[PDB]
């Protein structure tokens, strides 16, 4: 996402009132483009054996691309939600 910031500070509007914008308040500077941020990883709980990652029920940090294109769409993995973690915890302790 493109994140921008006004060059010109907007005067305070008040509590219930809405800020009044003028020609100069439409001038922006790009503070950041999120697409250029370093890639982070997705936490997933595997459901089936997958090469070089894990077997089943093990929390894994996978590249978001892989997680969203192969694992999750194919059901090989599930989101590491608290519910999924709990369910796989009962699965583990029931073995």
- Residue 79 in contact with another protein, rule: CB under 8 A: yes
CB of 61 to RNA, least distance (A): 15
Rounded CA-CA distance 28/7 in Å is 6
Q: How far is the CB of 78 from RNA (least distance, A)?
A: 19
Contacts of 44 (CB under 8 A, 6+ apart): 59, 60, 62, 67, 71, 72, 77, 78, 79, 80
Residues near another protein (CB under 8 A):
1-7, 10, 12-13, 19, 21, 25-31, 34-35, 42, 64, 68, 73, 79, 81, 83-84
């Amino acid at each position: 996402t493109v994140i921008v910031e006004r060059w010109w500070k907007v005067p305070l509007a008040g509590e219930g009132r809405k800020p009044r914008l003028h020609r100069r308040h439409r001038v922006y500077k790009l503070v950041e483009d999120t697409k250029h941020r370093p890639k982070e990883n997705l936490e997933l709980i595997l459901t089936q054996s997958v090469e070089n990652v894990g077997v089943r029920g093990d929390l894994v940090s996978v590249k978001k691309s892989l997680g969203r294109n192969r694992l999750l769409p194919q059901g090989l993995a599930v989101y590491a939600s608290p519910e999924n973690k709990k369910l796989f915890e009962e699965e583990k302790l029931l073995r």
